[PDB]
Write an enzyme that holds these catalytic residues in place. Structure first.
Site, mmCIF file in Angstrom:
data_model
loop_
_atom_site.group_PDB
_atom_site.id
_atom_site.type_symbol
_atom_site.label_atom_id
_atom_site.label_comp_id
_atom_site.label_asym_id
_atom_site.label_seq_id
_atom_site.Cartn_x
_atom_site.Cartn_y
_atom_site.Cartn_z
ATOM 1 N N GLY A 5 46.275 44.982 34.848
ATOM 2 C CA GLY A 5 45.539 45.426 33.668
ATOM 3 C C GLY A 5 44.301 46.183 34.095
ATOM 4 O O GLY A 5 43.787 46.048 35.213
ATOM 5 N N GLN B 252 35.856 49.584 33.370
ATOM 6 C CA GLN B 252 36.020 49.371 34.794
ATOM 7 C C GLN B 252 36.078 50.660 35.580
ATOM 8 O O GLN B 252 35.818 50.633 36.777
ATOM 9 C CB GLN B 252 37.260 48.586 35.120
ATOM 10 N N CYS C 249 40.468 40.265 39.571
ATOM 11 C CA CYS C 249 40.071 41.429 38.799
ATOM 12 C C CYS C 249 39.863 42.623 39.710
ATOM 13 O O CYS C 249 39.253 42.481 40.763
ATOM 14 C CB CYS C 249 38.734 41.142 38.066
ATOM 15 N N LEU C 250 40.279 43.813 39.276
ATOM 16 C CA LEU C 250 40.067 45.022 40.075
ATOM 17 C C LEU C 250 38.591 45.368 40.262
ATOM 18 O O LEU C 250 38.242 46.062 41.221
ATOM 19 C CB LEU C 250 40.771 46.200 39.457
ATOM 20 N N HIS D 288 41.563 38.525 29.251
ATOM 21 C CA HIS D 288 40.751 39.060 30.357
ATOM 22 C C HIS D 288 40.309 40.482 30.059
ATOM 23 O O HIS D 288 39.156 40.858 30.241
ATOM 24 C CB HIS D 288 41.565 38.946 31.652
ATOM 25 N N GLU D 289 41.239 41.321 29.657
ATOM 26 C CA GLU D 289 40.915 42.715 29.399
ATOM 27 C C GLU D 289 40.084 42.913 28.154
ATOM 28 O O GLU D 289 39.186 43.764 28.126
ATOM 29 C CB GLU D 289 42.200 43.562 29.344
HETATM 30 ZN ZN LIG Z 1 39.274 42.540 35.159
#
Ligand SMILES: [Zn+2]
Length: 188
Positions: free
Chosen positions: A60, A65, A108-109, A150-151
Site C-alpha cells: 500500500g 508518503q 511501512c514504506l 494503515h493507509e
Molecule cells: Zn505506511
C-alpha cells in the site's frame, strides 16, 4: 472523458518515478487535502504511485508518503490472482469498523526496516471514489482491512508507530534505523 489507462506491471523498476519520505519528515504529519478532480493527470499520478510502490516492495502507498498532498491511496496485496487489479481509493471515508481487536506485525514504506505489532479492528467498511470517479463501497477483513486502516491513517497524519504499545520494542526498532522516538505522536 478519461484517456489514461492504469495498466501497471507489478515489477520493480531501475528508476522508480516518485521518492519516498520517512518518519520525521513533516509531510507525513499533514492531513491530506481532498481530491477535487479525478482526471487523467490524477491517473498518471496513480500509475506513478503504483510503480513506486512495486519498486519499494510494498503493498500500500498513500500520496503523502511520496510528498503529494492528496486523499489518494493505492493498495495491491492479492497473492493468488497475480494480475488482479489494484485497489485505488480517492477521498475515502471509514464508515465503521467491526470484529475484534487483532494484533499483527506491520511495516511501512515510510519507516523502512521497522516492524512492530499494532492492534486494529479486524473489519473495516470504507466508501470512496475509484480511479474512474465512480462511487464505491467496500467491506474488508484480514490483511486488506489492516492495510486500508494503515493507509487511511496516512491521510490523517498518523503513522503506525503511533499505535505501538511496547516501549522497549518501539525504541529499539527506531533507534537501530536512525529514527527518533520523538517523532512518534499519540493516538487521538
Ligand atoms: Zn505506511
Amino acid at each position: 472523458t478519461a484517456a489514461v489507462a492504469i495498466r501497471v506491471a507489478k515489477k520493480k523498476l531501475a528508476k522508480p518515478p516518485l521518492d519516498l519520505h520517512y518518519l520525521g519528515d513533516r509531510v507525513l504529519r499533514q492531513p491530506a487535502k481532498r481530491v477535487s478532480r479525478i482526471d487523467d493527470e490524477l491517473r498518471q499520478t496513480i500509475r506513478q504511485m503504483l510503480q513506486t510502490m512495486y519498486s519499494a516492495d510494498g503493498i500500500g502507498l498513500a500520496a503523502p508518503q511520496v510528498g503529494i498532498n492528496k486523499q489518494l491511496i493505492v493498495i495491491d496485496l492479492e497473492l493468488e490472482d497475480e494480475q488482479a487489479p489494484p485497489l485505488v481509493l480517492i477521498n475515502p471515508k471509514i464508515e465503521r469498523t467491526a470484529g475484534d481487536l487483532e494484533q499483527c506485525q506491520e511495516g511501512c514504506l515510510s519507516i523502512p526496516g521497522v516492524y512492530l505489532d499494532v492492534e486494529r479492528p479486524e473489519i473495516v467498511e470504507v466508501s470512496y471514489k475509484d480511479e474512474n470517479g465512480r462511487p464505491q463501497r467496500l467491506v474488508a477483513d484480514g490483511l486488506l482491512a489492516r492495510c486500508i486502516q494503515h493507509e487511511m491513517d496516512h491521510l490523517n497524519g498518523v503513522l503506525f508507530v503511533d499505535r505501538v504499545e511496547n516501549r522497549l520494542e518501539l525504541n529499539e526498532a527506531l533507534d537501530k534505523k536512525g529514527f527518533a522516538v520523538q517523532a512518534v505522536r499519540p493516538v487521538a
